[PDB]
């Protein structure tokens, strides 16, 4: 609390959405497959926009 | 990252009008966006007698 007085904080909307998507158990495995395959290449990401 | 690069053909810090403390004021104050502007205007007042 002492460090974060005037520093940037996150709005409650994105906190609610992000908490829901880490607590989602019906998360599709398609996202895991695509994240495993494109594997952080800019050439692979921008080819699948 | 620690010294602001201002080339000597464009005026140095210790000769210019706007100096380092005004920059340190504007980058390290987290109060508001209205009172920051009025405080910055309260900065820009001459110290001539």
């Amino acid at each position: 609390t002492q460090l974060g007085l005037g520093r940037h904080t996150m709005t409650p909307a994105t906190i609610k959405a992000v908490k829901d998507t880490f607590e989602d158990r019906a998360y599709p495995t398609i996202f895991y497959m695509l994240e495993a395959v494109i594997h952080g290449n800019e050439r692979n990401f921008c080819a699948l926009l | 990252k620690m010294v602001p690069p201002i080339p000597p053909f464009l005026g140095a810090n210790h000769h210019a009008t706007i100096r380092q403390p005004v920059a340190y004021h504007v980058t390290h104050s987290k109060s508001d966006f209205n009172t920051l502007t009025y405080s910055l205007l309260g900065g820009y007042f001459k110290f001539t007698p």
């Binding site: 800019e42 050439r43 921008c46 080819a47 926009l49 | -």
Partner: protein
């Protein structure tokens, strides 16, 4: 295409594999025969990727040719800076 002749799996099988949307794996198998196998696996996917890239063949009367995507030479760059596309549009050309 001849003579090898068709993949019945078996083991060989034939590396292209020039079929489209094959429900041959399932399909019957039924199951695989009594051979040791090691690849099998690799030569199947190598042929399958070819039998999708060559199975493209058409749909190029709808493209909209691929481009440089990012910024790169383009061997002149001395009278025209280079900018590529972000592929967000719909290539169909009608």
């Amino acid at each position: 295409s001849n003579p090898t002749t068709f993949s019945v799996e078996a083991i060989a099988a034939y590396t292209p594999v020039a079929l489209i949307r094959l429900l041959n794996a399932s399909g019957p198998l039924q199951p695989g025969h009594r051979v040791d196998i090691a690849d099998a696996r690799s030569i199947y996917t190598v042929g399958a990727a070819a039998s999708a890239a060559r199975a493209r063949a058409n749909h190029n009367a709808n493209t909209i040719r691929r481009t440089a995507m990012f910024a790169e030479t383009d061997p002149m760059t001395w009278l025209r800076p280079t900018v590529g596309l972000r592929r967000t549009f719909n290539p169909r050309i009608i």
